[PDB]
């Protein structure tokens, strides 16, 4: 018998839908209260002179709906590196020396918890996705993490550098295909974010860049994705359908330039406006095909870029305040951790469902949506199936 | 009737294997003779006074089996960005300013050609993979190309920044799954590499910097990949089987750091020695399941890191000197173009197959291998089926 390329293909493909089998999360040790961040931020940047600007920054932190955030940077590390406290001093190398080491360390912690939950030999991992918006190096963070966890050296790696806030959707859209087209494929997915690359002192001039100093926080999340679960693997959610789109009238809305001064952020245009004006379209393309029109009847995981996005979406669509609970909880407790955020929220949804003894991992509901938002302006959509408890 | 995730997955997947349906390539316009380069390079870098070092470089360029390379950089641009011409000076904002605009323009040229060959409308592209090693930005080169080509806003992007030389394997490995798991999916892949980011002056202390300045050249390549070819599509090669592995005793062999002075390559260990020692393993892994042990009976595409790599691989396996023609031709005519190189070589192989009326797109042979080599030390393997000409 001659082995045909067609016969190899039928034999090489998995059968069933891509399934999230574990979630692990992790943060750095230094916790930072939002209530007193203004006094702290303006103190440690030798910026007490700029008084009228401080009062604006209070309003920003007051409206932020963030209780606290975790950060690898502390006052110790800042004294050892004052170039990072300037608004615009040459400081990429100091910042790169931080994040190149630290992004894969925080990554490893999250991976360990996901692997433990999955409870299979780490040797059965076939594929690794590693996602970060905090520095770049060669070999990459994906390699550092392969070494740190001691995965099989012939693990298939996908390093996704410098993507931004929507990449939490991007990693699920990728993992979905790797699992569904490969029999026995077990995909480890890691998003790890460190605002050391982004942190700077303030100025009157670029107001946009001060909003970031109030929302962004550090965090890592890991998931395990695979098709055809063994009886001894515990499914959480199915990945069903995925979309990435660029919003119209959105050119230059969220910008990120990696410079000699580190990573800079620029807002033009009304991000919340743009997302809310265009959000029903994304929902229709996802859910019309399934015969679903009631957006209060599906569970919600939406990247919390700030509190304005969430409020303007809710208002536009007429979501009950319950639907953003899991999203608003992660925002309050951690802030905007960029790509990691939606994976944390997905954990928050599971934890709540178990806690209040609801019928499914998705607040007792069958179908759900995950949304990443970020530069483009890019919207990533993932349609989900809950699992029964 | 009630929609099931299992019934959705049956509908949503492709049938057959991933098929390269098109290849297009581009270079910057300024062409550069290797015969003369040592004088050019030492003048524009105000360093003819370093005369013993020039002799080392003349000897490197002599040993390189490179006739010529293409360069975005020229004399006018270096004279107007003199921070690039130092060995070490703050030069990153200058290089980023260049390659963020340029890396995607070059990609668009290659993509346009690939699209023409494929012969379908660009509205039927569903996925874009963009791969470079030359700067970063948010939004990224992927969003920049989508805009330049006027692809659909809801195209699914995969932005692979900063992976280096093995990535031509990585982009086929990725595209194989995107295509095979999604019915109707047509994948535009683009690798685009500009050496403006790594080009610097010479010094005695870092003799490894200098090897790079003698091997690395500029270029872009694009391919269309898809499963279930239409009657009016024209298959070139099938993607059968992919692998990635890190080599033992290879820690630190190829390093790359993005700093304020630009991208810097580093070398420990003997890179040709490590690849030669370990390659037969990768081939047994790939080909024994297909009952192939005679590596002269398959067609080759190897990343030409240097002549050394190709010289020792051929010596170790006992390959008839014909197997590595295609590979050595792209090296001779274009130099080490990192991620794009193996895609130029694939095209060269199909080109030469047609010129000489051979039975198949792979020099008359049915079965082939593509090898990516890069930082790790990483080795990508891609098993290819050729097509009856």
Give the CATH number, domain containing residue B367.
3.40.47.10
Q: What is the DSSP letter of A64?
A: S
Cis amide prior to B377 (ω within 30 degrees): yes
- Residues A54, A62: Cα–Cα separation, whole Å: 12
Structure tokens at B133: 């090693």
**Is residue A377 one of the residues assigned to a domain?**
yes
* E strands present in A206-253: 219-226, 237-246
Bridge partners, residue B244, by sequence: B380
Enter the tokens of residue B367. 């079965």
CB burial of residue A379 (10 Å; 0-12, 13-18, 19+) = buried
Name beta bridge partners: A246: A378
Q: What is the Cα–Cα distance from B222 to B171, expressed in whole angstroms?
A: 10
CA distance A141 to A131: 9
A344 inside domain: yes
Distance CA B231, CA B114 (A): 18
Query: Which residue in B has a C-alpha nearest to residue A16's C-alpha?
Result: B6
* Nearest residue to A262 (alpha-carbon basis) of A185, A321, A201, A338: A201
How are strands ordered across the β-sheet holding B254-259? A137-138, B254-259, B262-267
B193 touching chain A per CB within 8 A: no
The gap from C-alpha A113 to its chain's centroid, in whole angstroms, comes to 17
Within a domain: residue B284? Answer: yes
* Distance in angstroms between the alpha carbons of the first and the last residue of chain B: 48
Interface of A with B in 8-67 (CB under 8 A): 8-9, 12-13, 16-17
- The CA distance from A327 to A343, in Å, is 10
A177:B173 CB<8 A: no
Tokens standing for B21? 């349906």
The owner of tokens 């004399």 is B75
CB neighbourhood size of A269 (10 A) = 15
Q: Which of B93, B160, B173 sits opposite A259 (nearest CB)?
A: B93
Chain B residues with beta carbon closer than 8 angstroms to that of A153:
245-248
Which residue, A353, A341, A351, A352, is CA-closest to A310? Answer: A341
Interrupted backbone of chain B, residues before each interruption (C–N > 2.5 Å): none
Q: Which residue has the tokens 């790509």?
A: A339
| DSSP H or E stretch at residue B184 | none
- According to DSSP, residue B216 is labeled B
How far apart CA B165 and CA B343 sit, in angstroms, is 12
Please, which residues have CB within 8 angstroms of residue A194's CB and are 6 or more apart in sequence?
A28, A72, A98, A99, A102, A103, A106, A132, A134, A135, A218
Q: Best residue in A7, A139, A241 to probe B by mutation, most B CBs within 10 Å?
A: A139
Length of chain A: 389
Taking the CA atoms of chain B, what radius of gyration do you get in angstroms? 21
Q: How far is the C-alpha of B197 from the C-alpha of B261, rounded, in Å? A: 9
Evaluate whether B287 touches B298 at the Cβ level (below 8 Å).
Answer: yes
Query: For this structure, is A191 an active site residue?
Result: no
Task: Tell me if B190 is assigned to some domain.
Answer: no
Question: Which of A8, A160, A243 comes nearest B240 by C-beta?
Answer: A8
Torsions phi, psi for A135 (to 5 deg) = 85, 175
CA distance A181 to A179: 6
Classify B102 in phi/psi space as left (phi over 0), alpha (psi -120 to 50) or beta.
alpha
**B13: chain A residues, CB-CB within 8 Å:** 13, 180
C-beta neighbour count of A63 within 10 angstroms:
12
The radius of gyration computed from the CA coordinates of chain A, to the nearest angstrom, equals: 21
Q: B378 and chain A: CB distance < 8 Å anywhere?
A: yes
Asked if residue B157 lies in contact with residue A243, where contact means CB atoms within 8 angstroms, the answer is no
Other beta carbons within 10 angstroms of residue A127's beta carbon come to 23
Q: Which tokens belong to A201?
A: 């002192």
**Is residue B174 helix, strand or coil?**
helix
> Which one from B61, B131, B165, B341 is the annotated catalytic residue?
B165
Q: Quick one: closest CA in B to A3, which residue?
A: B290
Contacts 24+ apart (CB under 8 A), B53-62: B53/B202, B53/B203, B53/B204, B53/B210, B56/B207, B56/B210, B57/B202, B57/B210, B57/B213, B57/B214, B60/B210, B60/B211, B60/B214, B61/B34, B61/B35, B61/B37, B61/B214
Mode of pairing for the β-strands spanning A262-267 and A254-259: antiparallel
* Dihedral angle over CA of B63, B66, B69, B74, nearest 10: 30
**Resolution in Å, one decimal place:** 2.5
Contact A238 B5 (CB under 8 A): yes
| Euclidean distance between CA atoms B130 and B147, whole angstroms | 13
In contact, A217 and A334? CB cutoff 8 Å: yes
B173 in contact with A, Cβ within 8 Å: yes
| CA dist., res. B34 & res. A208, Å (int) | 49
- The number of beta carbons lying within 10 Å of the beta carbon of residue B181 is 24
> Rounded to the nearest 5°, which phi and psi values hold at A77?
-60, -30
Measured distance CA(B61)–CA(A67) in Å, rounded: 61
Q: How many domains does chain B have?
A: 1
With an 8 Å Cβ cutoff, are A161 and B244 in contact? no
CA angle (B90, B95, B97) in 5-degree steps: 115
Q: What is the C-alpha to C-alpha distance for residues A175 and B177, in angstroms, rounded to an integer?
A: 10
B300 — phi, psi (to 5°)? -115, 145
Contact A226, A126 (CB under 8 A): no
Q: CB distance A245–B92 less than 8 Å? A: no
What residues does A188 pair with on adjacent strands?
A: A128, A224
Residues of B in contact with A159 (CB under 8 A): 160, 162-163
- Rounded to the nearest angstrom, the gap between the alpha carbon of residue A141 and the centroid of all alpha carbons in its chain is 16
Q: In the block, which residue shows the tokens 């295509």?
A: B179
For B155, list phi and psi in degrees, rounded to 5. -70, 140
Of A177, A183, A248, which to mutate for an interface test with B (greatest number of B Cβ within 10 Å)?
Answer: A177
Structural tokens at position B265: 């390559």
CA distances from B104 to A252, B110, B134, B192 (A): 17, 10, 10, 7
Yes or no, beta carbons of A5 and B17 under 8 Å apart: yes
Check: CB of residue A375 under 8 Å from CB of residue A255: yes
Distance CA B294, CA B314 (A): 13
Residue A265: which of B334, B239, B139 has the closest Cα? B139
How far apart, in whole angstroms, are the C-alpha atoms of residue B111 and residue B318? 37
3-state DSSP call for residue B113?
A: helix
Looking at the partner chain, which of B5, B157, B258 has a beta carbon nearest the beta carbon of A136? B258
Longest dimension (CA), chain A: 83
Inside any domain, residue B220? no
Say whether B153 and A245 touch across the interface (CB within 8 A).
yes
- Closest CA–CA distance from residue A198 to any residue of chain B (Å): 13
Burial class (CB in 10 A: 0-12, 13-18, 19+), A151: buried
Helix segments in chain A, DSSP class H: 5-12, 37-44, 51-63, 75-79, 92-118, 141-149, 167-180, 208-215, 271-287, 307-317, 325-334, 341-355
Cβ distance of A162 and B238 shorter than 8 Å: no
Considering the domain boundaries, does residue A211 fall inside one?
Answer: no
Task: Suggest the residue from B5, B13, B89, B97 to mutate for an interface test with chain A (most A CBs closer than 10 A).
Answer: B5
Is the CB of A137 less than 8 angstroms away from the CB of B162? Answer: yes
Check: CB of residue A145 under 8 Å from CB of residue A107: yes
Q: Which residues pair with B224 in a beta bridge?
A: B22, B188
**A89 and A83 in contact (C-beta within 8 Å)?**
yes
Which helix (H) or strand (E) segment is A374 a member of?
Answer: strand A367-374
For helices A92-118 and A141-149, what crossing angle results, to 10°? 40
Tokens of B331: 């090296």
d(CA A117, CA A101): 26
**Residue A362, SS3 per DSSP:** coil
* Selected residues 89-148 of chain B with any CB under 8 Å from a CB in chain A: 90, 92-93, 96, 133, 136-140, 143, 146
Q: Which domain holds residue A303?
A: 237-386
Residue A215 token pair: 């929302």
Helix (H) / strand (E) containing A140:
none
Q: Which residue does chain B place closest to A134, by CA atoms?
A: B136
Give, as one character, the DSSP assignment of residue B223: E
In a domain, B198, yes or no: no
B94, B83 Cβ separation under 8 angstroms: yes
Alpha helical stretches, state H, chain B: 5-12, 37-44, 51-62, 75-80, 92-118, 141-149, 167-181, 207-215, 271-287, 307-317, 325-334, 341-355
Method for this entry: X-ray
Residues B338 and B332: beta-carbon distance below 8 Å: no
Distance CA B55, CA B69 (A): 21
**What's the token pair of residue B290?**
């297909």
Spatial distance between the Cα atoms of B341 and B192, rounded to a whole number of angstroms = 10
- Give the minimum alpha-carbon distance from B376 to chain A in angstroms, rounded to a whole number: 6
Residue B79 neighbours by CB distance under 10 Å: 10
For residue A369, being part of any structural domain is answered with yes
Give CA–CA dist A57/A69, Å, rounded.
Answer: 16
**What DSSP element (H or E) covers A187?**
strand A187-193
């Amino acid at each position: 018998h001659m082995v045909s390329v067609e016969e190899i293909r039928k034999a090489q493909r998995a059968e069933g839908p891509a399934t999230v089998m574990a979630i692990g999360t992790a943060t750095p040790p230094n916790c930072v209260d939002q209530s007193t961040y203004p006094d702290y931020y303006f103190r440690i940047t030798n910026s007490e002179h700029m008084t009228e600007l401080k009062e604006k920054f209070k309003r920003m932190c007051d409206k932020s709906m963030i209780k606290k955030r975790y950060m690898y940077l502390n006052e110790e590390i800042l004294k050892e590196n004052p170039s990072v406290c300037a608004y615009m001093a040459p400081s990429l190398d100091a910042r790169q020396d931080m994040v190149v080491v630290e992004v894969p360390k925080l990554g490893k912690e999250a991976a360990t918890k996901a692997i433990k939950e999955w409870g299979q030999p780490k040797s059965k991992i076939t594929h690794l996705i590693f996602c970060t918006t905090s520095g770049v190096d060669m070999p990459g963070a994906d390699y550092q993490l392969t070494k740190l966890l001691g995965l099989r050296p012939s693990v298939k790696r996908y390093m996704m550098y410098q993507q931004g806030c929507f990449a939490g959707g991007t990693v699920l859209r990728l993992a979905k295909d790797l699992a569904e087209n490969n029999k026995g494929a077990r995909v480890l997915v890691v998003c790890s974010e460190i605002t050391a690359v982004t942190f700077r002192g303030p100025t009157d001039t670029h107001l946009d860049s001060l909003v970031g100093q109030a929302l962004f926080g550090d965090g890592a999340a890991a998931v395990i994705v695979g098709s055809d679960p063994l009886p001894v693997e515990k499914p959480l959610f199915q990945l069903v359908w995925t979309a990435q789109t660029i919003l119209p009238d959105s050119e230059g809305a969220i910008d990120g330039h990696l410079r000699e001064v580190g990573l800079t952020f620029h807002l033009l245009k009304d991000v919340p406006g743009l997302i809310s004006k265009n959000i029903e379209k994304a929902l229709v393309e996802a859910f019309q095909p399934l015969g679903i029109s009631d957006y209060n009847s599906i569970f919600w995981i939406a990247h919390p870029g700030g509190p304005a996005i969430l409020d303007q979406v809710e208002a536009k669509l007429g979501l009950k305040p319950e639907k953003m609970e899991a999203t608003r909880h992660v925002l309050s407790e951690y802030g905007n951790m960029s790509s990691a955020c939606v994976l944390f929220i997905l954990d928050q949804m599971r934890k709540k469902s178990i806690e209040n003894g609801l019928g499914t991992t998705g607040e007792g509901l069958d179908w759900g949506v995950l949304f990443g938002f970020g530069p483009g302006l890019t919207v990533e959509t993932v349609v989900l199936r809950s699992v029964t408890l």
